Design a protein around this ligand. Structure first.
Ligand code: K5C
Ligand code: MG
Lengths: 556, 412
């Protein structure tokens, strides 16, 4: 006998104040009972379960299931109830590596650790809660009662405890063999390196000698897989990666279900196919829970789909990461709040691509969106590669300087250079800091009746120009913007505008270049046409000249 | 200190489960080195999967030091930790601290690692050194001793601290010494020579009781509520008078007695904004009467320790930042301005992060707690970058302002 080290036990508890499960065993056919007795007799011989007396008061139901041509019975212990009552664990497997962050490992071996799994002992004080009962033949004897000594498949803690147990065992080997990578996926242990085949096989043998310290035997996986690894929806090739085939279905009838999967395929594709767009196709799912409502496609969704098929016609691939080279992120504006990007180290050899869609909001501008895209890519790049990339952005250095020095919020984007890739991001208007000498002064105001929704908007100027327009189905806030719009429409290329509307000032000072409000949009269009605009605010109802005059004109 | 002081969470609350945010490779490497040494020294231990809790960590560099330092963001744990009435009913916040000519900040967080943490509470201090690209499970640890930045540490250690200082306090009755979290604030009214000597005398005294060698120096003499000032001009345009009436109208929300009728009278008509308007005698008197009102303090301003402090900040351009601290609107307890922030002439976010730390430090000296910030920045920009410039062992709370306030003009 070669002494072997025990696998350290994880202590486990039920949730506070909860007892173990007490679920009644279902009646089973004589055939199923016979099958369960043989399965459990074998499991008991292997140490996985033990027979228990009748003093244990807990129970979980057991079932017997089959397969189509697989003609033997399967045991199923349904731990749903125990799982509800078991403490939460650190689930150490939630996120998966992005392929573009992996580094080349010429040699990879796949080891089966399915057998090692059963060397992980279940906390002895918790085993009582896993009891189950094989009903007896004709219910004429006491049922055969067992409990688990190993991690039950289907029990809440098994994945996290199995994973944490293997990691701890593997830790000294990884630490002392920095030239190999080790990654576990369920029962598969992937061991890679960039060594010559002979040296690689030696590291594998050394790893097996290491795992034997705990009595773990780990043969190579059955039917060794030729590249590429089909994993988590990717194709991992030795020198490249891509997504698995993106096939867009052809259809004359699209439902809410069809479009959801189309976006999902498109979204998945966007990590390597540059320029994917999903705005128009997403707008068709705004609010609806019926998944078979056939939603017709707009001509804009049709164009977007056709543009994606052109992008998807041919496979593309990403490269793996070289830490000795720079990391570069390039962004392009696509329109309608959509942005795409590429991250690469060498020109034309993308590590990955991606996209960014404008946030939901009433007003926004391209510089803010570009900034948001940069922060998103920054955080993604820290996740994947542990560093911020150098940015190439379609915005002139002078435009950025003007923006951040004048904008009322603090803002920052990390090291970047301008790339002349139209359409360029620009500032569409800039308000004056001081009143303009020689420019006409428009005092604007609007008001509306809260009940009738009747309103007025207008202006008076220092030249005696005046206008009041009666309005229907409006609001105070709307009449105040309308007044500003009229002053812009009716003035020359330079204009001073005086408003008492804190609301309108707050919208315009936010420097939107686009809005969900057609009125704001029309104001933006007017501002773009001016040479100089000074916008001044005064408090309402204080007797300020000009403002008092127009206020009375629009208040009935 | 073999005995541990029992600690519990608040009733009906579980431990924190805060996601670890992604870290750069150099910060991960720094944390691995730091935590390996802390583990060798017994300060922390590896934990297993039966511990589901988590608190974020990151890596920083203190004021002008090149060594990486570990910072745990215990904000969630601190609000889930029982309220502490540590050795008494409370430390009456020393109102004389803010009056000393000079206040020196001494990092004494090292003292905490000599006191063991209650064994049943340790699991709640769990944290993770993350992996890059999810390529390995994070490195999981929990504390075995009082952690820096945790609310319980100063309270559980306060008995020991008062004794370590008593001999120094005995000989120096005129020096105010205040502890907030990991920091000691040492105030006196003598020249830096004798002040620094006293400070270096205090750290030597501390070194014989079981350090850091670093310090910060403040001058709370100057902190007040800055007056509202009005322009003094020989010729006023229409625009000038409109800005003045707007500012006075804002001030009338703070001060009683402010009038604008005679100033508004000057604008009778529909005049060009750049037209020069002579002040009447009535308007001059009204302006003078407003100036006199604004020389006096605001009515009914008092600190209520049961309410949050709120700090607002405005970007004024050219490296200048104005801020106000209050509990109720228009009842400012303190206002101020910052300029030429050091080492960030081209980085707004670094400047804002430095202003937040300076304002928090002033708040600790004056009231013994940190304010809730209203930050003029988009959430995603702030949360991507602020840890890059953070140098304090505490972290305040903050919220984001997305609509530009008109008040920026009035503090201009
Ligand atoms: C090692 C490993 C394997 C898989 C596969 C699952 C499946 N199904 C997944 C992950 C996350 C792995 O984990 C890491 N993988 C890498 N790099 C990779 C290694 C594999 N190659 C692809 C490849 C290479 C050689 C052959 S070959 N010629 O042997 O047939 C076939 C395929 C790309 C880079 N780096 C790290 C670092 C820390 S973990 C980890
Ligand atoms: Mg009005």
């Amino acid at each position: 006998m070669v002494p072997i080290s025990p696998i350290e036990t994880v202590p486990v508890k039920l949730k506070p104040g909860m007892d173990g499960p007490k679920v009644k065993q279902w009646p089973l056919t004589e055939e199923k009972i016979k099958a369960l007795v043989e399965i459990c007799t074998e499991m008991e011989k292997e140490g996985k379960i033990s027979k228990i007396g009748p003093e244990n008061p807990y129970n979980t139901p057991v079932f017997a299931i089959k397969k189509k041509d697989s003609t033997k019975w399967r045991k199923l212990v349904d731990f749903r109830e125990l799982n509800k009552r078991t403490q939460d664990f650190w689930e150490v497997q939630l996120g998966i590596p992005h392929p573009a962050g992996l580094k080349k490992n010429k040699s990879v071996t796949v080891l089966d650790v399915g057998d090692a799994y059963f060397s992980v002992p279940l906390d002895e004080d918790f085993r009582k809660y896993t009891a189950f009962t094989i009903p007896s033949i004709n219910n004429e004897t006491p049922g055969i009662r067992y409990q688990y000594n190993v991690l039950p498949q289907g029990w809440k803690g098994s994945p996290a405890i199995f994973q944490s147990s293997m990691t701890k065992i593997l830790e000294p080997f990884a630490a002392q063999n920095p030239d190999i990578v080790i990654y576990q996926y369920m029962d598969d242990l992937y061991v890679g390196s960039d060594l010559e085949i002979g040296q690689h096989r030696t590291k594998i043998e050394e790893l097996r000698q290491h795992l034997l310290r705990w009595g773990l035997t780990t043969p190579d996986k059955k039917h060794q897989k030729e590249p590429p690894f089909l994993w988590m929806g990717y194709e991992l090739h030795p020198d490249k990666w891509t997504v698995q085939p993106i096939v867009l279905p052809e259809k004359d009838s699209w439902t809410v279900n069809d479009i959801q999967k189309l976006v999902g395929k498109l979204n998945w594709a966007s990590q390597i196919y540059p320029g994917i767009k999903v705005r128009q196709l997403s707008k068709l799912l705004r609010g609806t829970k019926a998944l078979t409502e056939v939603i017709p496609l707009t001509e804009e969704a049709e164009l977007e789909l056709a543009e994606n098929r052109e992008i998807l016609k041919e496979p593309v691939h990403g490269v793996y990461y070289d830490p000795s080279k720079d990391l570069i992120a390039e962004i392009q504006k696509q329109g309608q709040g959509q942005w795409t990007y590429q991250i690469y180290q060498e020109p034309f050899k993308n590590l990955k691509t991606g996209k960014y869609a404008r946030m939901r909001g009433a007003h926004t501008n391209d510089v803010k969106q570009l900034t948001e895209a940069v922060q998103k890519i920054t955080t993604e790049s820290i996740v994947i590669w542990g560093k911020t990339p150098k940015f190439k952005l379609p915005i002139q250095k002078e435009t950025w300087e003007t923006w951040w020095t004048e904008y009322w919020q603090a803002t920052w984007i990390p090291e970047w250079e301008f790339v002349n890739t139209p359409p360029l991001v620009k500032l569409w208007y800039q308000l004056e800091k001081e009143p303009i000498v020689g420019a006409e002064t428009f005092y604007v105001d609007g008001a509306a009746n809260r009940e009738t929704k009747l309103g007025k908007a207008g202006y008076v100027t220092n030249k005696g120009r005046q206008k009041v327009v009666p309005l229907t189905n409006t609001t105070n806030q709307k009449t105040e913007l309308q007044a500003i719009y009229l002053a812009l429409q009716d003035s020359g290329l330079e204009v001073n505008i005086v408003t008492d509307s804190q609301y309108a000032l707050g919208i315009i000072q936010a420097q939107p270049d686009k809005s969900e409000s057609e009125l704001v949009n029309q104001i933006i269009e007017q501002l773009i046409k001016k040479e100089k605009v000074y916008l001044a605010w005064v408090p309402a109802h204080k007797g300020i000249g000009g403002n008092e005059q127009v206020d009375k004109l629009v208040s009935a | 200190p073999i005995e541990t002081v029992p600690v519990k969470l608040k009733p009906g609350m579980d431990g924190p489960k805060v996601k670890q945010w992604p870290l750069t490779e150099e910060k991960i490497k720094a944390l691995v080195e730091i935590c390996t040494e802390m583990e060798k020294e017994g300060k922390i231990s590896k934990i297993g999967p039966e511990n589901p809790y988590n608190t974020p960590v990151f890596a920083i560099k203190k004021k002008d030091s090149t060594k990486w330092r570990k910072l745990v963001d215990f904000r969630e744990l601190n609000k889930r930790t029982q309220d502490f009435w540590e050795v008494q009913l409370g430390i009456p916040h020393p109102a004389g601290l803010k009056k000393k000519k000079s206040v020196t900040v001494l990092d004494v967080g090292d003292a905490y690692f000599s006191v063991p943490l209650d064994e049943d509470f340790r699991k709640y201090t769990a944290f993770t050194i993350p992996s890059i690209n999810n390529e390995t499970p994070g490195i999981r640890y929990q504390y075995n001793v009082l952690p820096q930045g945790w609310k319980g540490s100063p309270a559980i250690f306060q008995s020991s601290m008062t004794k370590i200082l008593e001999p120094f306090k005995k000989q120096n009755p005129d020096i105010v010494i205040y502890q907030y979290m990991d920091d000691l604030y040492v105030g006196s009214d003598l020249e830096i020579g004798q002040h620094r000597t006293k400070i270096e005398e205090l750290r030597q005294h501390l070194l014989r009781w079981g350090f850091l060698w670093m310090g910060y120096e403040l001058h709370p003499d100057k902190w007040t509520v800055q007056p509202i000032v009005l322009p003094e001009k020989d010729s006023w345009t229409v625009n000038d008078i409109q800005k003045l009436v707007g500012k006075l109208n804002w001030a009338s929300q703070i001060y009683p007695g402010i009038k604008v009728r005679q100033l508004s009278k000057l604008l009778r008509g529909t005049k060009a904004l750049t037209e020069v308007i002579p002040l009447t005698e009535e308007a001059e008197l009204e302006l003078a009467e407003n100036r006199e009102i604004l020389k006096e303090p605001v009515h009914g301003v008092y600190y209520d320790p049961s309410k949050d402090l709120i700090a607002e900040i405005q970007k004024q351009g050219q490296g200048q930042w104005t801020y106000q601290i209050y509990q109720e609107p228009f009842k400012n307890l303190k206002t101020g301005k910052y300029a030429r922030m050091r080492g960030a002439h081209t980085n707004d976010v670094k400047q804002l992060t430095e202003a937040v730390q300076k304002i928090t430090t002033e708040s600790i000296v004056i009231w013994g707690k940190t304010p809730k910030f209203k930050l003029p920045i988009q959430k995603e920009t702030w949360e991507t970058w602020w840890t890059e410039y953070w140098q304090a062992t505490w972290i305040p709370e903050w919220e984001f302002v997305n609509t530009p306030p008109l008040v920026k003009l009035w503090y201009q």
